[PDB]
Amino acid sequence: SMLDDAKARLRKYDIGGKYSHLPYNKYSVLLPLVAKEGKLHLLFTVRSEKLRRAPGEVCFPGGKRDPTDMDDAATALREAQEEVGLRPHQVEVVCCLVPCLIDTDTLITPFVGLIDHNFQAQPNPAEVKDVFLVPLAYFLHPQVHDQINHIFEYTNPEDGVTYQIKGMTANLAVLVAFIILEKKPT
């Protein structure tokens, strides 16, 4: 099946806990996969304009590890719950992708999660201005604008709203699309 095939692909890129004990400032992100209308989508947040770090930018749910977290995957799930109301029973964490090094002292670990079909986002307005889906296949043929670094523009055909996706967020979206969608019969 589509979901079994995605999980099987994702598992081949799982690095697991290999890098998780290293003494960094630690953040986790959830790359949330949603199946709608026969296709896979990624769920993105738009950060509240109130936030000091990157107000109004598109990112994945996630945040800083805290002492309660049993592991890095727990960080991502805790933060996703706080930000968009995703409950742990509504997500299956399939794997841990390549961590992202930033600022010399920070390590961001991404987890891919399969999201339950009955989940409906409840944006927490103190943290999240908007939540939206992008079809995973979009990231294979994105609409690119050079700002000189590359920015994706995605227009939701439901309402005509355009979102800008860039940086680590855009890079991780492409990675997940390659992993899941490369080399498939039609």
Chosen residue from 20, 75, 109, 169 binding ligand H0M by CB under 6 A: 169
Do the annotations mark residue 83 as ligand-binding?
yes
Strand boundaries in the chain, DSSP class E:
25-36, 39-47, 58-59, 62-64, 91-96, 100-102, 106-115, 128-135, 144-146, 150-155, 162-165
Q: Does 138 bind ligand H0M (CB under 6 A)?
A: no
CB 84 within 8 A of CB 97: no
CA 178 to chain centre: 14
Chosen residue from 35, 168, 174, 179 binding ligand H0M by CB under 6 A: 168
Give min distance, CB of 107 to ligand H0M, in A. Answer: 10
Chain residue at closest Cβ approach to ligand H0M? 62
Separation between Cα atoms, residue 101 and residue 54, nearest integer Å: 18
Chosen residue from 6, 29, 97, 133 binding ligand H0M by CB under 6 A: 29
Separation between Cα atoms, residue 85 and residue 34, nearest integer Å: 15
CA 151 to chain centre: 17
**Per-residue contact flags (x/-) with ligand H0M for residues 54 to 93, judged by CB under 6 A:** -----xxxxx-------------------x----------
Cβ-based nearer residue to ligand H0M, 45 or 81: 45
Separation between Cα atoms, residue 80 and residue 31, nearest integer Å: 10
Cβ-based nearer residue to ligand H0M, 30 or 177: 30
Do the annotations mark residue 182 as ligand-binding?
no
| Residue whose tokens read 């990112």 | 59
Q: Pick the stretch among 32-40, 53-61, 65-73, 135-143 that binds ligand H0M (CB under 6 A).
A: 53-61
CA dihedral 68, 173, 169, 113 (to 10 degrees): -10
Give residues in contact with ligand H0M (CB under 6 A). 27, 29, 45, 47, 59-63, 83, 108, 127-128, 168-169
Residues at the annotated binding site?
Answer: 79, 83
